[PDB]
């Protein structure tokens, strides 16, 4: 399951 970040849920890593 993917690591996302911020109010935009940007793809950060897996």
């Amino acid at each position, epitope marked *: 399951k993917s690591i*996302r*970040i*911020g*109010p*935009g849920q940007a*793809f950060y890593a897996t």
Partner: antibody
Amino acid sequence: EVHLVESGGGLVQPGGSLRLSCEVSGLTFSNSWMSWVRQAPGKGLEWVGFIKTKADGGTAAYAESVKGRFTISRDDSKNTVFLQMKSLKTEDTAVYYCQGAVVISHEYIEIWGQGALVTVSS
Amino acid sequence: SVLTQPPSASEAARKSVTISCSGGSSNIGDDSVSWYQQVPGTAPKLLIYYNDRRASGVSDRFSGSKSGTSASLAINGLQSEDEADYYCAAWDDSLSAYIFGSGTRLTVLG
């Protein structure tokens, strides 16, 4: 270096509609995850929604309280994300901030616009 | 699912404070925390992301940590220009939204 310039702010009657624009310079818009956060006068920060990059879903997500009333969309060729608001309630009165976020060289970058005040009043 | 923070914090200059942020298993327990700084009448600005990573250009005096369902922001060598509202934030899986904590107002005594 990076500027998110918002426009479209102002006064709208309850039940009315208003479109905010956020135009990005200095970031490659097409690679930026775009989002919106609002803040009522004197209150905290409340998430409104986002829209993914085309390469990601290209799809939008919404706060429960704005779902069905607000639509977020993006025009990659014009470096602009929009927040289209309909059936506005007095409760929606707030400064609306857009964010652009990119991931580069394992660096996360998130930049905020200056805000646009939306006043929902009769 | 609301990230609670103490309303206020007040510590002398040259000194250090820790702003606390406590959430639940559905947010901080699944996702990372970010921290934002908002100076009166200015746009919020990202300080920390992914629990402990500083945004570019942000002073090394700031550091963040996550521990279970709690998060913390450390400000060392306190300067008067640090007076602002500090907000934690995290994605909540169960209601599928980005949650901002209630926010702490920081006062640098002196």
